[PDB]
């Protein structure tokens, strides 16, 4: 319970599975440099929920960008360097609080999300 996602949950009220066209779907962080803005989404084990983790961190830190696994969908920004994002790591709820999902400006809004 010492490890968590930096971002809030994305509850899925609809029946349609979550999807994102290329580029969109990456929450924005002012602390993050344009190189660091690269990671994945993991479906919450136990409605389904999705958590964003940076590349090389989180429950699937060992997966390289582009792997196929059910529950894992990959997103990345432009100019994002392919490195382990160890300098961001994950979130400790004891020392830091969860950050509201920071969607980019005028992004896609699939069914069920307002």
């Amino acid at each position, epitope marked *: 319970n010492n490890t968590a996602s930096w971002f809030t949950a994305l509850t899925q009220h609809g029946k349609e599975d979550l999807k994102f066209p*290329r580029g969109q779907g990456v929450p924005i962080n002012t602390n993050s440099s344009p*190189d660091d803005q*690269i990671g994945y989404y993991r479906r919450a084990t136990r409605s389904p929920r999705w958590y964003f983790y940076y590349l090389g961190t989180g429950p699937e830190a060992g997966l390289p*960008y*582009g*792997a*196929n696994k059910d529950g894992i969908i*990959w997103v*990345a*920004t*432009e*100019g*994002a*360097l*392919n*490195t382990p994002k160890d300098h961001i790591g994950t979130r400790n709820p004891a020392n830091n609080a969860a950050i509201v999902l920071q969607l980019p400006q005028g992004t896609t809004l699939p069914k069920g999300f307002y």
Partner: T-cell receptor
Amino acid sequence: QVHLVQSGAEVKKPGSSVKVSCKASTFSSCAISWVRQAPGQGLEWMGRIIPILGIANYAQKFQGRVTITADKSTSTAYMELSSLRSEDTAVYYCARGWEFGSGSYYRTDY
Amino acid sequence: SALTQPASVSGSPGQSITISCTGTSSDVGGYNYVSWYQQHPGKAPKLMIYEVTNRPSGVSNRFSGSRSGNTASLTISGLQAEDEADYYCSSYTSSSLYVFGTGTKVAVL
């Protein structure tokens, strides 16, 4: 648009070698591959090369007699196939690609 | 590894058909780098699909890609006689290589 020219047709005898070229009309971090196709048969991938790095990966079926090399200064890449035999009669292609691997991203939509 | 493809494919022109491309867990169902190529008889291969679904610019939306399990499927819609050519699938491997399919030749009635 970037197009590729090669070395002309060749007619060699078994036991000798062959060195084909592949010139591009970007030779930075470019995955250059050579593919084969026996007449009436399917495609068969053979090798890869990143020129500025020099690391070349080969398919295990061809690992041992084919060799891929790059000339980054001239923007040309060579391929050296030795120990030629009858079953190696086929049409040989070259192609330029891109691979992310451990480099920086570009919205170039590579 | 090995990539299994249907040898031949055909249908009434103007219609659509799904062409399969099967492999193992570490070449098609492990990575998202499945590709598709067209090769006219006598002409060099040409690209229509680079990522599993992504289509390069200058290619009509009549071509679209998809993947299920370890079996990707190419779906040509509104097939014309101008598409008469070979169709091959390729994908990245955990061995950091490329593997092609056995080949699917086409014919329009």
